[PDB]
Amino acid sequence: HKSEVAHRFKDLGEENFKALVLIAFAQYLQQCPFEDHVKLVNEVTEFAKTCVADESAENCDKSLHTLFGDKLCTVATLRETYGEMADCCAKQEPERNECFLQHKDDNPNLPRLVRPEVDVMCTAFHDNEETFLKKYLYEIARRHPYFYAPELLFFAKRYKAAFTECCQAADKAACLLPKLDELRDEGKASSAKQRLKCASLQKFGERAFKAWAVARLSQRFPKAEFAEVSKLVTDLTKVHTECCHGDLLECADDRADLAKYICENQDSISSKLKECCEKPLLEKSHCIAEVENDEMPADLPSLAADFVESKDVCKNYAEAKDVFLGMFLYEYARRHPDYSVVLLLRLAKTYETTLEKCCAAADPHECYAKVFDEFKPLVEEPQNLIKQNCELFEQLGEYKFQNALLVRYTKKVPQVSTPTLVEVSRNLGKVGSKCCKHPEAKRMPCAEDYLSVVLNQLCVLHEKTPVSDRVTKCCTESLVNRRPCFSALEVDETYVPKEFNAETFTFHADICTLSEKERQIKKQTALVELVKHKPKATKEQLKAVMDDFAAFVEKCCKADDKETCFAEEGKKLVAASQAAL
Ligand SMILES: CCCCCCCCCCCCCC(=O)O
Ligand SMILES: CCCCCCCCCCCCCC(=O)O
Ligand SMILES: O=C(O)c1cc(I)cc(I)c1O
Numbered sequence: 046h047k048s049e050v051a052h053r054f055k056d057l058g059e060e061n062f063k064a065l066v067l068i069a070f071a072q073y074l075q076q077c078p079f080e081d082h083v084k085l086v087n088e089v090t091e092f093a094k095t096c097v098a099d100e101s102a103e104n105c106d107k108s109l110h111t112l113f114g115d116k117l118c119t120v121a122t123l124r125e126t127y128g129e130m131a132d133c134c135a136k137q138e139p140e141r142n143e144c145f146l147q148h149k150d151d152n153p154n155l156p157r158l159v160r161p162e163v164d165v166m167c168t169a170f171h172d173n174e175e176t177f178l179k180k181y182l183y184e185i186a187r188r189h190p191y192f193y194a195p196e197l198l199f200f201a202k203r204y205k206a207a208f209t210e211c212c213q214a215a216d217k218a219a220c221l222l223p224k225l226d227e228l229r230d231e232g233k234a235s236s237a238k239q240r241l242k243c244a245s246l247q248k249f250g251e252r253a254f255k256a257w258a259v260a261r262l263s264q265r266f267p268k269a270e271f272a273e274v275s276k277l278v279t280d281l282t283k284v285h286t287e288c289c290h291g292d293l294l295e296c297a298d299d300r301a302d303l304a305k306y307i308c309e310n311q312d313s314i315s316s317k318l319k320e321c322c323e324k325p326l327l328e329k330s331h332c333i334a335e336v337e338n339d340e341m342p343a344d345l346p347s348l349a350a351d352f353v354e355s356k357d358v359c360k361n362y363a364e365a366k367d368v369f370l371g372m373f374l375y376e377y378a379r380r381h382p383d384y385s386v387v388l389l390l391r392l393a394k395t396y397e398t399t400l401e402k403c404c405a406a407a408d409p410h411e412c413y414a415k416v417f418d419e420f421k422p423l424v425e426e427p428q429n430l431i432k433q434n435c436e437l438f439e440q441l442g443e444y445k446f447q448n449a450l451l452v453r454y455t456k457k458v459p460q461v462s463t464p465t466l467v468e469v470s471r472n473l474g475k476v477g478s479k480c481c482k483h484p485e486a487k488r489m490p491c492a493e494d495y496l497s498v499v500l501n502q503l504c505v506l507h508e509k510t511p512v513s514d515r516v517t518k519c520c521t522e523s524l525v526n527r528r529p530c531f532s533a534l535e536v537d538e539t540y541v542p543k544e545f546n547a548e549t550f551t552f553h554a555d556i557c558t559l560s561e562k563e564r565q566i567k568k569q570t571a572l573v574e575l576v577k578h579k580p581k582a583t584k585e586q587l588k589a590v591m592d593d594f595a596a597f598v599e600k601c602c603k604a605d606d607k608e609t610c611f612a613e614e615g616k617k618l619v620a621a622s623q624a625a626l
Contacts, residue, residue: 047100047101047105047106048096048100048102048105048106049107049108049109049112050092050093050096050105050109050112051093051096051097051100051105053093053109054093054094054096054097055097056326057326057327059090061198061327062090062093063086063090064179064182064198064201065194065195065198066085066086066089066090067082067083067086067179067182067183067186068182068186068194068197068198069113069194069293070082070085070086070117071182071183071186071187072149072186072187072189072190072191072192072194072293073117073145073149073190074117074120074127075150075153075155075187075188075190076126076127076153076187077120077122077126079179079180079183081120082183083179085116088116089116092104092112108138109294110138110142110294111138113142114134114138114141114142114145117134117145118131118133118134127148129148130144130145130148132144133145133148142292146290146291146292149190149191149291150190151190151191153187153188153190155187155188158184158185158188160225163217163218163221163222164217164218166208166212166221167208167211167212167217167221170208170212171212174205178201178204178205181204182197182198182201185197189236190291191239191240191291192235192236192239193239193288193293193296194293194297195297195327195330195331196235196331198327199327199328199331200228200231200232200235203228204228207221207224207225207228208221210224211224234498237498237501237502238497238498241497241498241501242285242289243285243288243289244501245257245524246285246286246289247289249523249524251282251286252367253524254282254285255278255279255282255371256370256371256374256390256393257386257390258277258278258281258282259274259275259278259371259374259375259378260374260375260378260386260389260390260393261378261386262274262277262278262281263374263375263376263378263379264338264378264379264381264382264384264386264389264490265315265336265338265339265382266314266315266339266379267338267339267340267341267342267379267380267382268314268315268316268339268340268341268342269313269314269315270313271371271372271375273310273313273314274375275371277303277307277314280299280302280303280306281303283299284296284299284300284303287299288300300330301326301329301330303330304329304330304333305329307322307333308321308322308329315336315339316339316340317336317337317338317339318333318336318339320332321333321336338382341379341380341382345380348373348376348377348380348417349417351376352373352376352396353413353414353416353417356410358400358404358409358410358413359400359403359404359409362400362404363404370393370396370397373393373396374389374390374393377389377392377393382486382490383485383486383487383489383490384424384489384490385427385489385490385492385493386490386493387493387524387525387528388423388424388427388489388493390525391423391525392420392423392424394525395416395419395420395423396416399412399413399416399419400413426529426532427489428489430532431480431485431488431489431492434477434481435477435480435481435488437449438474438477438478438481439481443474443475443477443478444474444565446474446477447470447471447473447474447565447569448569448572448591450470450473450474451466451467451470451569451572451573451576452572452576452584452587454466454469454470455573455576455577455580456536456537456576456580457534457535457536457537458512458513458515458516458534458537459537459540459576459577459580460512460513460537460540461512461513461516462512463570463573463574463577464570465506466573467566467569467570467573469499469503470569471569472499473499475495476491476492476495476496476499479491479495480492480495496528500527500528500531503516503520504516504519504520507520508520515534518530519531519533519534536580537580540580542577542578542579542580543574543577543578544578545578545623546574546578547619549571549574549578550571550574550575550615550619551615551619552567552571552598552611552615553608553611554601554602554607554608554610554611556568556598556602557598557601557602557607568594568598572591575587575590579626582626586625586626589625590622590625590626593618593621593622594618597614597615597618600614601614601615
């Protein structure tokens with residue numbers, strides 16, 4: 046490999062290459078117009094071809110970091126448009142590249158993307174497919190500078206597949222919309238997860254990150270040996286550190302490597318890793334990351350043998366603490382792919398604590414004897430929450446369920462902004478739909494997965510505009526205590542009911558013309574405000590007031606002269622209701 050560009054060009058292929066250079070340039074020069082990046086992609090692509098034909102052609106020998114930075118520094122508007130960023134072209138490549146990552150605005154001042162009408166999109170998609178998907182890839186890229194490019198390209202192809210299909214259908218809207226909403230959520234879900242892992246790494250450091258990775262990789266690869274798992278974690282830890290820093294190339298190569306490794310040692314790691322290892326370069330790592338858990342060996346011993354009933358536990362521990370605990374996790378995780386990762390960590394931390402007490406006691410073995418017994422309540426806590434909640438969800442569907450949460454949390458944290466409470470309660474309700482569909486054994490992992498994102502978003506918002514110390518407590522706790530902390534919140538008996546507002550409970554006939562989406566939002570907002578004005582209201586009281594309301598809306602959105610039924614009958618409701626409470 047004399048020419049780095051020629052090599053990448055050959056591994057990737059024209060199409061992928063061009064999409065990637067586009068994304069790459071958009072993530073740095075987020076303020077330049079589309080036509081400008083397009084010209085650049087062609088210049089870079091014409092260059093890459095020159096090197097595919099002769100690796101001795103000028104500059105073909107230069108490294109990607111150099112080629113990229115040099116190209117970047119040719120833009121004449123640079124100085125005027127990015128200013129300080131232009132000062133980076135005064136440094137030598139080593140730091141020049143570093144200077145660029147520093148001026149990568151994570152959340153720029155660009156308008157939110159508006160989804161056009163299905164027909165507008167389908168037609169544009171037909172008249173000129175390429176510039177249609179590239180214009181958007183550009184739009185998305187400039188807005189999410191740290192999103193892993195290949196991951197982005199992966200999303201694009203699913204978008205292209207949704208149009209090719211749906212845009213030929215009799216009723217396009219009915220086909221496309223549902224697909225455009227699935228992707229949106231996955232993209233947003235995927236992004237939040239990346240930002241979250243990097244935050245976690247930064248905040249709690251490498252040790253906690255590796256512990257987390259040990260548990261997750263063990264549940265996934267129960268067959269692999271601890272020596273293999275440690276090796277994987279180290280590599281995985283070095284990978285995220287590098288991808289979190291923001292350097293795309295570095296990140297790409299580290300992942301590529303790790304993916305090649307895992308494949309070569311496939312038999313030694315996991316069985317369900319075949320296909321993944323067959324896919325093209327760009328997809329290998331993405332596939333592996335989402336690989337399904339392998340089956341755990343049927344011939345596995347009792348943990349209590351090597352971690353409790355054995356003597357010399359303290360010796361093996363003292364010799365290499367983290368290694369020993371690392372082992373306990375590995376042994377406890379691959380036997381429990383049904384536990385959440387933080388639950389496994391919660392146990393490990395408990396084992397750690399007792400070993401740190403017991404090993405310094407008279408008779409250690411007899412001290413850490415009934416330690417497994419201390420795990421029990423830690424395991425049941427989350428299991429009961431799942432049974433308890435999904436049972437409720439099975440009764441009243443998603444919407445009514447979202448309502449029960451609405452009443453539950455508004456009573457626990459009144460000070461929170463009504464629109465904020467509606468937002469989270471709704472998302473939480475979705476997690477219920479998504480995870481309660483699974484068999485008992487996958488529910489916890491599923492909920493841990495969705496809750497982590499929602500809980501994080503919640504804390505960020507509260508960080509910016511604080512409202513409750515409790516929420517700040519829970520939010521600044523260890524990532525292992527975060528959720529149990531929020532589950533420990535109790536009804537706020539300090540709160541003083543807000544002043545009744547007639548306006549707040551006045552509804553017009555427009556709610557009849559609104560979409561189920563709006564109706565719900567409108568109603569749920571009134572529901573929250575109801576709890577804020579009379580938080581001491583029983584679930585019985587609320588239920589009755591809610592039913593009446595149901596009728597109300599119905600019996601008004603089906604009557605002659607709608608606008609009067611909502612003014613006469615409503616005043617009645619608001620009076621009848623006020624009295625009941
Ligand atoms: C390979 C490293 C394994 C280390 C095992 C330590 C397990 C303790 C739980 C990890 C969380 C540490 C942060 C905390 O105290 O909450
Ligand atoms: C003083 C109280 C004024 C009465 C206003 C009641 C508003 C409650 C909203 C109930 C909406 C529940 C939605 C539903 O029935 O599906
Ligand atoms: O999720 C990842 O980023 C990831 C990437 C590679 I490459 C291998 C494994 I296992 C992973 O979990």
